[PDB]
Amino acid sequence: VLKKNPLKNKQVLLRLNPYAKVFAAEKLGSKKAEKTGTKPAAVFTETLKHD
């Protein structure tokens, strides 16, 4: 009789989408990445800074 929004009302957000629980548990919206030590090529940097 009345529509209820998920993204408020965790109860409907949990009957829909069981995975929201573990999403919140692991937090999975501030997931830290693995840092890679890549450097762009001198050709790229020269082109970006070219006149």
Added chain:
Amino acid sequence: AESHRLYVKGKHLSYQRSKRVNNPNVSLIKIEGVATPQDAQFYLGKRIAYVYRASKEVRGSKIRVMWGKVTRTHGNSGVVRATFRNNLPAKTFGASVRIFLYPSNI
């Protein structure tokens, strides 16, 4: 003391209006000391009273009151919207209202 004032004193400006239409059901209020929406946010939800006088004595008093409450900010200059139970009769454009400090939250 000299003073007994627990209410900020404001002015009833026009109604909510277009250039050529008005909504009596929303009145515009200027609160003294208030020149920003960020300051008017303090006063949101506060009670307003327009106190007036009449000759007929009704229940011990010749004084009558219209209650209202602040609802939202209006504009950029601290002007505020209010909605009273029974609206303000438009004779009160430029008249003085009493913005009380309850419901309080500090």
Added chain:
Amino acid sequence: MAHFKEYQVIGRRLPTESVPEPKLFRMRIFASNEVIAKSRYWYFLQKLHKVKKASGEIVSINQINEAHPTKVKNFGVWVRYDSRSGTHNMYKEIRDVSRVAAVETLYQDMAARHRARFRSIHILKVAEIEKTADVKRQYVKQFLTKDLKFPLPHRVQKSTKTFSYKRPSTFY
């Protein structure tokens, strides 16, 4: 347009069985977003070469930032602008901290002094002048003068309340 930005847009013909790996052109575009950037890019390449967004490709959209956004520079700018009855060229001098800023106040300058719009104005070139004496415009040279000092007379205080009690002054 808006608060500008500077991009390199790199672009290409669509590869063919005849011509794989086409030639990769590039432009430094002044625009407030990537969309206007790519648009200006296809505008200027659709002028210069036989290409269009349909028969072409955008390979890179990269943002260029000032290497030194705190060093004051003296920019020369070469402009082409469609006036009402004709189209002309120009050189201008702009002392500013950044290219985006110089080009912003340039568009504003053209709008004010020559009534020219973003659509009418091309930006042929923007170039920092390494040394003084290769400047040609008094309205930059007079700030390039040594030991520069000046006042700002007639200081106006913006008021809060609509009634004052003091009859203010302009001391400074």
Added chain:
Amino acid sequence: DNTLLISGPFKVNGVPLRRVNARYVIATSTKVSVEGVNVEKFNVEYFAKEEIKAERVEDQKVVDKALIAEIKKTPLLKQYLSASFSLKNGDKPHMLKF
């Protein structure tokens, strides 16, 4: 019943053991210690309703004693409580750090 219990204290500014509501008070920053007071006794039955009662007057005294004693420990606090609040000209409640 979602209320606040208050005392003036009654001998200080004339306000007895009274119920009030939280949305009708300004919480100031000024704080005496309730430690040493026995207000657990009170309830909506205490303030129930159908000249002053001995329970009321005597309980007011018992609270006032310890509370006033703690209030002496701060200068001008008795006179602060005795005084009443009023907004003066130029007082802007949205910039008063109560």
Added chain:
Amino acid sequence: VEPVVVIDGKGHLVGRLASVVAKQLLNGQKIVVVRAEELNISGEFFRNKLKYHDFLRKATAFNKTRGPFHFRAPSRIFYKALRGMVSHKTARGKAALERLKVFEGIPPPYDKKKRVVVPQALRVLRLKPGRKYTTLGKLSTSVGWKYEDVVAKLEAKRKVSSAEYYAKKRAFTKKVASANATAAESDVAKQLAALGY
């Protein structure tokens, strides 16, 4: 906030002061304007004089007593400018205009009261230095107003009496500054300095 606000039109610009005043009146404020002979208009004298003559040519042809009424005094030029800014054919407009009062000079009830200014209406702040401005008593005299020298004599008189008052005031204020800064060594005054006074 104050019940009556006595503005001193010296240095003020007619239109900017007029709009400020009108809105205050409609918001429900009593304003009285004094020394409106010293009120300024932008542009040069000849211009503002021609504009007056253009307004003066206008007149109901079949009865010029019915026509627009061309008031000459600076107070009434101000009133004209300001009633253009008020919705004056309403009860509300009439009420605002009754809250209003305007004067050439500073007459007896308001010479003993403080005068105020309006920085968003002042010539010296608004106008760029260089631009030529006009003075409304000079204009009004040129287009018909008679009593420019009566006001000048009376204002000379008033300025004398007020300068004497200010001498007394300044002497007593010297006395009081002495009596205060001799007591800015007490513990009470140092406590006030701590708290902000």
Added chain:
Amino acid sequence: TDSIVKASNWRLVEVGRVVLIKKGQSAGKLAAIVEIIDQKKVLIDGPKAGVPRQAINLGQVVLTPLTFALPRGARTATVSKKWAAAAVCEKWAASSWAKKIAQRERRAALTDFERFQVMVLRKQKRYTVKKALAKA
């Protein structure tokens, strides 16, 4: 009998002039003009105050009568160094204008009980001063 000219001393914009940012993020803070860009634009910097090095408008700042010594176009550490070696924050706080700003801030930060106290102290002071004025 010598010539007389007042000359109307101004506070100038110049490398070394120390400004008071009044609006913005900094907004109530000290900075210093490193280099002049135009009649209205200056590069400022205050590293002790947190103020980033940046171009700003001379109406968004207000100049101060204080001045210290800087070479043209100096870097941020340099201006920090010479700021400290001039010790100009002490001069600014010595000023009667910094005192007024702090006076405003303290008066704002007052609570109701500090304010009652202010009142009592003022009544006491004016008792003393009116007694002293009845004499002289």
Added chain:
RNA sequence: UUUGCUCCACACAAUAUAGAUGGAUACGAAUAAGGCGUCCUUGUGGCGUCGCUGAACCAUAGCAGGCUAGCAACGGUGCACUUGGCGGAAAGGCCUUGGGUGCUUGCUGGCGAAUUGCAAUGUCAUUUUGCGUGGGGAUAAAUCAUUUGUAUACGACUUAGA
């Protein structure tokens, strides 16, 4: 001309409020300039400080502000008198003398304030009128009609009449 009219003081009714609720807190001129203070040989002078706005200044504690007892001080302030002076631009206000009387929160204490029963303007202002009490004071005119013609369509105007 009925023992009516008016001014003042009080009391009671009604009358409404373009709309009080700590204070409209007084130089003048300038704005590429000034204010305040000080000094002098008194000026378009030297020195110092201030301004970057009234978020200032004054006032403000007490049963809507009660009754009390003292300490200090010779001050502040309310009222009713009272001395003189100034002010006509719409002055109708500004200043000042002397005492009478109260209050003082300048300081320290005593008593009381409860039930408006968890908030309801919770009435504490101004204006006018009217009958009534205490007194003081003054105790005419116009119009109709008659009349005149310096006037006139009628009104009106000019005139006269105890």
Added chain:
RNA sequence: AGAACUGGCGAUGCGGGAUGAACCGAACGUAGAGUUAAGGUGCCGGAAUACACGCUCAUCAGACACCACAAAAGGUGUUAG
């Protein structure tokens, strides 16, 4: 005056263009709350006498579509090229 293709007025209110059959926005059950279009925010008038860059001072300024007009030609007037 007369054709082509769409869209509208007619037959249709509402918001804006002061005012207007047809322009702009959007089409109308009775309400309430919120957000917006077009157009605007000195005062009349709801909303910034907002921020920023510059040009213009008219002893005939100018002030935004339909739209209620102005041209050729001229000026060590000012500004930039």
Added chain:
RNA sequence: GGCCAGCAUCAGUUUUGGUGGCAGGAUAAAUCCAUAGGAAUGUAGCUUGCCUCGGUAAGUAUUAUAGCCUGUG
């Protein structure tokens, strides 16, 4: 148990704030540090007139009794 209200806890629509964590970019650009080079709206210093001591007018000198720009990391 009828009329007018107030507070709390909730539901829906909505608005205005405070705050935390995370990713991308030249894995921001800068700043800062180090390093190489450079000059000038030429700092210290030196040379020459004015020179009332002092500083000036030039010449030299590019970090020294101040700094700056560029490139690399």
